C-alpha cells in the first residue's frame, strides 16, 4: 500500500522480551521444493529458501542488524579481530563450547576446510560462490585448535560476509573432500551447530522439521520446533488462512488483500536486498550469443510496465530496479539502465541492421526464426512477467517461447546448465553487495549461468575489490554495473517489497529486511499480550 520498495534501516518483527513469550510452540512455514542438495555452498544447493532454513542451524560469525551493521556473534566466536589491515589478516577465535551435532568441536580446521573448498584451487568442488576465498593466501592455526588466522593476498573489504549473512560455517566433514561436498548432502544436511537441528526429513509428507539442538550451548529457544511444508505458490495464502502455516510472503496486491482481510494475520514490511530479473544466455550456440542481438532484444522489454503491473497496490510509486549491484535505498544506488532503455523502434532498427528482418511471422536470419526460450518457475506472478515481455517482444518481431517449469531441479537441471535463452529468477542479497561481482558477473563466475562476460568487466571488478575506500569502491562498482548493462547480461525487474503475512501471535519474527533473526527469541505471545514497547 504506502511504503516504497527500498531497503531501509528497520525490521518489522513485533519485538518482545522472549522471556515473556510462551515456552514452546511450532513455527510452521512453507518451502517451494525439497532441495536437490542440502550443501548450501554447492552449485545445486544455493537455494535461498534452504539457506534461510539453515540459518537456524549453522554458525554465522556476525549478526547483521536492520541497518546492515555487524556485531560478532559471541555464541560462535569469542572474538573476531582485524589483526592487520593491509595485508589483511583476520583472526577468528572460536567459542570453546561450540560443538557440531555429532559431538565434534568446532575448530580452526572447519574454517580452513571451508575456505579451501570454495577457493577455486581444486576444480572438483562444484561451488556456487567463492565469497572471496580465492583471495586468502593462507588459513593457519592460531594459539590453539580453536583459533584460525586468515591471511589475505589481496584486499577484500567484505571479509565479514564469508561466514555471515547469506554465508555460514559448515563442518570440515562436509567440506574437506570433493566427494563429501558434492554428494554428501544429497539426502539431507550434515552435522550442524545452532539453536535448532534438522531432525526429520519426510519426503512422503513433504515436511522438514527443526527441533531444539540438545547440544546447543546458548540461550534455550522459546520454540519447540520450526516445521517447513512443501507448498506451491498458489497454496501459500490459503494455507495461512486455513491455519496450516504461520507466515508466508506477500508478493502481489491480491495476496496482500487476502492476507489483510484474514483475522489473526498481521502485515509486516521491511524490504531486503533481493530482486527478480531476466538473465540472458550468451553461451556459444545460443541465439543470444550475439551481444548486439542481446542489446536490441533488451530494448524491446518494457521493464517499467512490468514493475508497475507486478507491484501496483503493493508498494508506492512502483519502479523497476535499475542496478545489478545496489538496490533502491542502498548507498551507491543509481540508474545505469539507459544503454537498454525501452525503445521498440530503435530495437527494430537494430534488428534490421543485424539481418533479423521481417521475413515471416517473426523476424528471420539465415533460415532461423528469432525465437527466445524464456525459462521461468511456473506461478501466477512469474507467468505474468513472461506474458508482458512476450507481448512487447512480439510487437518487434521477436517470439518469446514461454518454457514454464517446476520442481526441485529448476536450477540444477535447467538454469545451472544453460537450458534457456532468457531465464527469470531472483537473487537474494545480504549486507555484502560486492561479493556478488566475482560470483555472478566475472567471466569465470561460478553463478555466471549465461556465460556472458568480458575482460573489461573482469578488470573493473578487480579495481572494485582492490579499493579500500568505501565511496570510491561504490563508484567503481557502479562502473562495473554500467558495463554489465552494456553487455546485455541481465535485466533487473523488481526488487522485493519486503511484505510478509505473519500470524499475529508471533513475536521476534516478521519482515527482517537487512537483519538476521535471533532464532532463540522467536516465540508465540501469551493471551492478552497486547503491549508493544518497540
Amino acid at each position: 500500500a504506502d511504503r516504497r520498495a527500498a531497503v531501509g534501516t528497520t525490521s518489522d518483527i513485533n519485538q518482545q522480551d522472549p522471556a515473556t513469550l510462551q515456552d514452546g510452540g511450532n513455527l510452521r512455514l512453507s518451502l517451494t521444493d525439497f532441495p536437490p542438495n542440502f550443501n548450501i555452498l554447492h552449485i545445486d544447493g544455493n537455494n535461498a529458501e534452504v539457506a534461510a532454513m539453515m540459518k537456524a542451524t549453522l554458525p554465522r560469525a556476525f549478526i547483521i542488524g536492520p541497518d546492515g551493521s555487524t556485531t560478532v556473534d559471541t555464541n560462535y566466536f569469542t572474538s573476531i579481530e582485524l589483526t592487520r589491515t593491509a595485508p589483511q589478516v583476520v583472526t577468528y577465535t572460536i567459542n570453546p563450547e561450540a560443538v557440531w551435532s555429532d559431538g565434534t568441536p568446532i575448530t580452526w580446521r572447519d574454517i580452513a576446510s571451508q575456505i579451501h573448498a570454495i577457493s577455486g584451487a581444486d576444480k572438483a568442488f562444484e561451488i556456487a560462490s567463492s565469497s572471496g576465498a580465492e583471495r586468502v593466501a593462507s588459513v593457519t592455526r592460531g594459539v590453539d585448535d580453536r583459533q584460525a588466522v586468515v591471511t589475505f593476498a589481496k584486499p577484500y573489504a567484505e571479509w565479514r560476509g564469508m561466514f555471515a549473512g547469506n554465508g555460514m560455517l559448515l563442518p570440515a566433514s562436509m567440506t574437506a573432500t570433493p566427494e563429501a561436498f558434492n554428494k554428501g548432502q544429497l539426502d539431507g544436511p550434515g552435522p550442524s551447530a545452532g539453536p535448532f537441528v534438522v531432525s526429520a526429513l519426510d519426503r512422503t509428507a513433504q515436511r522438514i522439521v527443526l527441533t531444539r539442538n540438545p547440544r546447543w550451548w546458548g540461550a534455550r529457544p522459546r520454540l519447540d520446533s520450526i516445521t517447513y511444508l512443501v507448498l506451491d505458490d498458489a497454496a501459500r495464502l490459503p494455507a495461512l488462512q486455513n491455519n496450516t502455516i504461520d507466515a508466508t510472503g506477500v508478493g502481489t496486491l491480491d495476496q496482500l488483500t487476502i492476507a489483510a482481510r484474514t483475522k489473526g494475520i498481521s502485515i509486516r514490511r521491511a524490504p531486503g536486498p533481493s530482486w527478480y530479473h531476466f538473465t540472458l544466455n550468451g553461451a556459444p550456440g545460443s541465439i543470444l550469443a550475439d551481444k548486439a542481438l542481446r542489446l536490441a532484444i533488451a530494448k524491446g522489454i518494457d521493464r517499467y510496465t512490468i514493475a508497475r503491473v507486478a507491484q501496483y497496490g503493493l508498494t508506492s510509486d512502483p519502479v523497476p530496479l535499475n542496478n545489478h549491484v545496489f538496490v533502491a535505498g542502498q548507498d551507491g544506488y543509481q540508474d545505469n539502465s539507459g544503454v537498454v532503455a525501452y525503445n521498440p523502434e530503435q530495437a527494430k532498427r537494430e534488428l534490421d541492421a543485424l539481418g533479423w528482418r521481417r521475413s515471416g511471422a517473426f523476424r528471420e536470419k539465415d533460415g532461423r526464426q528469432l525465437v527466445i526460450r524464456d525459462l521461468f518457475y511456473d506461478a501466477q506472478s512469474t507467468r505474468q512477467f513472461a506474458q508482458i515481455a512476450q507481448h512487447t517482444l512480439a510487437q518487434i518481431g521477436v517470439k518469446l517461447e514461454l518454457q514454464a517449469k517446476s520442481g526441485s531441479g529448476f536450477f540444477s537441471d535447467y538454469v545451472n546448465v544453460g537450458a534457456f535463452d532468457i531465464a527469470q529468477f531472483g537473487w537474494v542479497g545480504d549486507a555484502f553487495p560486492l561479493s556478488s561481482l566475482t560470483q555472478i558477473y566475472a567471466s569465470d563466475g561460478e553463478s555466471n549461468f549465461g556465460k556472458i562476460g568480458s575482460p573489461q568487466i573482469d578488470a573493473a571488478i578487480e579495481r572494485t575489490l582492490a579499493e579500500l575506500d568505501p565511496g570510491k569502491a561504490r563508484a567503481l562498482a557502479n562502473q562495473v554495473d554500467e558495463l554489465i548493462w552494456a553487455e546485455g547480461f541481465s535485466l533487473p525487474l523488481t526488487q522485493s517489497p519486503g511484505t510478509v503475512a505473519v500470524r499475529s501471535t508471533l513475536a521476534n519474527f516478521g519482515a527482517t529486511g537487512l537483519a538476521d533473526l535471533d532464532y532463540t527469541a522467536i516465540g508465540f505471545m501469551r493471551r492478552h499480550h497486547h503491549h508493544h514497547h518497540h
Partner: peptide
C-alpha cells in the same frame, strides 16, 4: 546476491 530463488522475492 549469493543465493537464488525461483519466485520474485
Amino acid at each position: 546476491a549469493s543465493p537464488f530463488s525461483p519466485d520474485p522475492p
